[PDB]
Design an enzyme around this catalytic site. Structure first.
Site, short mmCIF file in Angstrom:
data_model
loop_
_atom_site.label_atom_id
_atom_site.label_comp_id
_atom_site.label_asym_id
_atom_site.label_seq_id
_atom_site.Cartn_x
_atom_site.Cartn_y
_atom_site.Cartn_z
N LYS A 11 39.52 35.72 55.75
CA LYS A 11 40.83 35.13 55.47
C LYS A 11 41.39 35.66 54.16
CE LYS A 11 39.63 30.85 55.73
NZ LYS A 11 38.24 31.21 56.12
N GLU A 26 40.38 26.96 45.77
CA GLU A 26 39.58 28.14 46.08
C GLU A 26 38.77 28.55 44.85
OE1 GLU A 26 38.61 30.04 48.67
OE2 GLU A 26 39.38 28.33 49.80
N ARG A 27 37.98 29.61 45.01
CA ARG A 27 37.10 30.05 43.95
C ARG A 27 37.90 30.56 42.75
NH1 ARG A 27 35.74 31.38 49.02
NH2 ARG A 27 33.60 30.97 49.71
N1 LIG Z 1 38.15 44.19 56.45
C1 LIG Z 1 36.88 44.01 56.05
N2 LIG Z 1 35.99 45.03 56.02
C2 LIG Z 1 34.72 44.85 55.62
N3 LIG Z 1 34.24 43.67 55.22
C3 LIG Z 1 35.02 42.57 55.19
C4 LIG Z 1 36.42 42.68 55.61
N4 LIG Z 1 36.96 41.47 55.50
C5 LIG Z 1 36.01 40.63 55.04
N5 LIG Z 1 34.85 41.29 54.86
C6 LIG Z 1 33.61 40.67 54.36
O1 LIG Z 1 33.61 39.28 54.66
C7 LIG Z 1 33.64 38.51 53.46
C8 LIG Z 1 34.50 37.26 53.61
O2 LIG Z 1 35.86 37.56 53.32
P1 LIG Z 1 36.81 36.45 52.66
O3 LIG Z 1 38.18 36.54 53.27
O4 LIG Z 1 36.66 36.54 51.17
O5 LIG Z 1 36.17 35.05 53.12
P2 LIG Z 1 37.04 33.95 53.90
O6 LIG Z 1 37.34 34.57 55.23
O7 LIG Z 1 36.13 32.76 53.95
O8 LIG Z 1 38.25 33.76 53.03
C9 LIG Z 1 34.15 39.47 52.39
O9 LIG Z 1 33.66 39.14 51.09
C10 LIG Z 1 33.63 40.81 52.85
O10 LIG Z 1 32.32 41.06 52.35
MG LIG Z 2 38.49 32.83 51.07
#
Ligand SMILES: Nc1ncnc2c1ncn2[C@@H]1O[C@H](COP(=O)(O)OP(=O)(O)O)[C@@H](O)[C@H]1O
Ligand SMILES: [Mg+2]
Lengths: 50, 468, 37
Positions: B159, B185-186
């Site tokens: 997300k 959020e963080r």
């Molecule tokens: N497009 C992408 N390509 C590679 N890894 C990804 C991608 N999107 C997310 N990730 C991995 O998944 C993790 C979760 O993404 P994030 O959006 O920060 O968490 P959330 O979906 O809970 O907000 C990321 O820190 C990354 O390591």
């Molecule tokens: Mg997030």
């Protein structure tokens, strides 16, 4: 009139309303501060103190 | 005329006022914590009138060190935040205080964070594609300019990476103002976003309002309202297009439910407050474009425990124009962005708006992926050899299609170490039309993984020993 | 008068912390008093 003035000054009314404090002190407070006046009916004074 | 604290239980404080001095609901009250280590000024939002001149308030700061009987002052108004062009390029908290330059904006015009939504007569449906360059988003979840976009998904599905990608793709060249609301959020992510915006030179045009997950429930409840107030000012007063990024809006509902039982309300289903839908409706209905005044809002919505039936995301669904739904299953396959193409939706994905070819290709892709989903279990148990010839061909096509919906995003370079790509919408439509016709069945499916357009596909096929 | 009442209440207050366990059990206690805690 006593009720109206007591409503006007909620601080004194709340202070009197605290039944935790011994009632002798509060009735003395009422006597000296409000109930003790020149134009105060003695019967009304006694009723309010009670 | 001042009140005094009667009861303190976590973030909820009862305050007794003299008769006739009871503050109005949502008024901001001030109390002092004088203990040296934690000395501060608590801001309390009046939540309820309890009768007998007691009000129940939600604290915006931790109440540790607060003492019963301390004086409570009524500001006579709700929480208010600075508004104007000055807020651009600066970081604030839910209470309007500037974090990067403390004391900044104190002299600006201040707007109450509590506001009625626009009148129904002022609402005009928005139907205009907002091209992003992401193949999956542009093909199956076309975004609406001036509309409401959501990114659903469970924890750690992408997300925030996708929010940052959309910032890069949309706000980097936006001609208007951007407001980013970090709701619960963080703090590390907030600092990273601040630094990234400063580096990209987009900060000058962006106002950041942060209430982190370490804040008490009241701050997480009100930070979204603060950022939304800044956005509403930019929409209604400055008369310029606005980009509103919210991450994560579910935290508003979660914070609301954290204090619901301390506020005396009997819990509803799944532990949520009885007023979930109403509070969400007020907040969301404030996040809209009005006739001639655009707010393109993009919200990250966290799905608790990946359960899309949970009341919070289920209630949120009704407020959106486009919804990109990220799936844990797609994530665990390594497909990024982990979009569930069969579960996402867009209100403008119809022939009238996007055009006959776009709609046709999207529907064909969805049909193929649905058939593949149906055949997954059969392939898992009885194997692929037992499928009919057309079903085998469709399975190959669907695997290639699901890989090709994957893309290397710029915001993901920090993870994959691979630079991102941008695919024009027409190229996406042509490529997926070719796929659905089987024009790329001779290429290994690995050639379709995390690439851009057909040029990248040809390059990767060459690298793998194939050729189109 | 509306003013002598003031002096009256102030004289009252001038002329007018250890808690006490009221109940306990299972690692929780309730303490009366300690108005400044
Ligand atoms: N497009 C992408 N390509 C590679 N890894 C990804 C991608 N999107 C997310 N990730 C991995 O998944 C993790 C979760 O993404 P994030 O959006 O920060 O968490 P959330 O979906 O809970 O907000 C990321 O820190 C990354 O390591
Ligand atoms: Mg997030």
């Amino acid at each position: 009139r006593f009720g109206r003035v007591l409503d006007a000054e909620p601080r004194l009314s709340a202070l009197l309303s605290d039944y935790t404090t011994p009632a002798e002190g509060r009735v003395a407070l009422l006597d000296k501060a409000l109930t003790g006046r020149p134009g105060v009916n003695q019967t009304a004074a006694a009723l309010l103190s009670q | 005329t001042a009140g005094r604290v009667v009861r303190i239980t976590g973030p909820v404080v009862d305050v007794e006022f003299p008769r006739g001095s009871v503050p109005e609901l949502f008024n901001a009250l001030h109390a002092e914590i004088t203990f040296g280590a934690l000395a501060k000024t608590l801001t309390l939002e009046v939540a309820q009138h309890l009768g007998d001149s007691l009000v129940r308030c939600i604290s915006m700061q931790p109440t540790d060190g607060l003492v019963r009987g301390v004086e409570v002052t009524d500001t006579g108004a709700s929480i208010s935040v600075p508004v104007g062009d000055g807020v651009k390029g600066h970081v604030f908290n839910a209470l309007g205080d500037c974090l990067d330059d403390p004391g900044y904006g104190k002299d600006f015009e201040h707007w109450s964070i509590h506001r009625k939504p626009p009148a129904f007569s002022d609402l005009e449906p928005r139907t205009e594609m907002l091209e992003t360059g992401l193949k999956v988003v542009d093909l199956l979840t076309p975004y609406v300019r001036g509309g409401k976009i959501a990114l659903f998904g469970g924890a750690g599905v992408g997300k925030t990476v996708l929010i940052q990608e959309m910032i890069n793709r949309i706000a980097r060249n936006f001609g208007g103002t951007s407001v980013f609301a970090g709701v619960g959020e963080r703090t590390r992510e907030g600092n990273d976003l601040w630094v990234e915006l400063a580096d990209a030179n987009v900060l000058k045009d962006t106002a950041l309002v942060f209430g982190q997950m370490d804040e008490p429930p009241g701050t997480r409840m009100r930070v979204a309202l603060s950022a939304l107030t800044m956005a509403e000012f930019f929409r209604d007063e400055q008369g310029q297009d606005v980009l509103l990024f919210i991450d994560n809006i579910f935290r508003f509902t979660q914070a609301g439910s954290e204090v619901s039982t301390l506020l005396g309300r009997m819990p509803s289903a799944v532990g949520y407050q009885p007023t979930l839908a109403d509070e969400m409706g007020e907040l969301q209905e404030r996040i809209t474009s009005t006739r001639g005044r655009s707010i393109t809002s993009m919200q990250a919505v966290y799905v608790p425990a990946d359960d899309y039936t949970d009341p919070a995301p289920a209630t949120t669904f009704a407020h959106l124009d486009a919804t990109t739904e990220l799936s844990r299953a797609v994530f665990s396959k390594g497909i990024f962005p982990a979009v569930d193409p069969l579960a996402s939706s867009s209100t403008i994905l119809d022939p009238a708006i996007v055009g006959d070819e776009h709609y046709r290709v999207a529907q064909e892709v969805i049909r193929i992926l649905q058939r593949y989903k149906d055949l997954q279990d059969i392939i898992a148990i009885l194997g692929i050899d037992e499928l009919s010839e057309e079903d085998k061909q469709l399975v190959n096509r669907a695997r290639r299609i699901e890989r090709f919906l994957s893309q290397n995003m710029m915001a993901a370079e920090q993870f994959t170490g691979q630079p991102g790509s941008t695919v024009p919408l027409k190229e996406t439509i042509e490529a997926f039309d070719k796929l659905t016709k089987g024009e790329f069945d001779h290429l290994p499916e690995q050639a379709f993984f995390l690439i851009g357009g057909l040029d990248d596909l040809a390059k990767k096929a060459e690298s793998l020993g194939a050729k189109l | 008068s509306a003013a002598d009442i003031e002096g009256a209440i102030e004289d009252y207050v001038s002329s007018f912390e250890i808690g006490t366990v009221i109940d306990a059990g299972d690692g929780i206690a309730h303490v009366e008093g300690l108005p400044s805690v």
